[PDB]
Amino acid sequence: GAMGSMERASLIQKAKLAEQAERYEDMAAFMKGAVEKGEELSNEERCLLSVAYKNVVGGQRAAWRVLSSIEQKSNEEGSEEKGPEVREYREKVETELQGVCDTVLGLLDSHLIKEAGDAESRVFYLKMKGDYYRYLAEVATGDDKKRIIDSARSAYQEAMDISKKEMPPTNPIRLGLALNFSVFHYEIANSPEEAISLAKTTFDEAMADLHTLSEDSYKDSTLIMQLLRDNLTLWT
């Protein structure tokens, strides 16, 4: 690994610098190097890992959607044949996206998840596993598409089961997990009713627990609750 010669602490330091410079590919490569040192990640370091790859794959997904939309229009009635270029370039972006997802899933499997025993780390990593299988599912069209979808569902479900047993309903990781699993139901699994039910129950159970929280925790939880509400408003 190209980061094998750099100190773990220096990799974390440079990940933070890359974030300030909005250099998310660098940030992700630094955090990949940090994970491959083999030590567990702290709360802050887990955040750096997720932020880096979320921005990298988010840009790839945005680009893939632009190209897939152009490709779909090219295949409509009355459209001029333009050659293989649009499909080729959509495939190029798609392959690069799949590569990033495979990299993240590889870090989770070797060996972040198996060493994560506390609820806050294990739920975090399983949510990530669900998310990156979800991104693979967004571009999947082949024999293994149903298995990709079920891999996302299985990871999300294990994270949900742990989060409900071990975390308060206002915990931001629990809330963000539920937000994303709800989107998985709506956009991937063709289950809009389950998506709406999960978002509403998650919102209502968090609402009832806000009274236990400090001012600062209240602000964190209500921020993600508003995203649940935004999705519900989008969907109803």
Binding site: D131, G176, L179, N180, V183, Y186, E187, I224, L227, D230, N231, L234, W235
Partner: peptide, 5 residues
């Protein structure tokens, strides 16, 4: 698109 985090 819907919100995710």
């Amino acid at each position: 698109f819907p919100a995710t985090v």
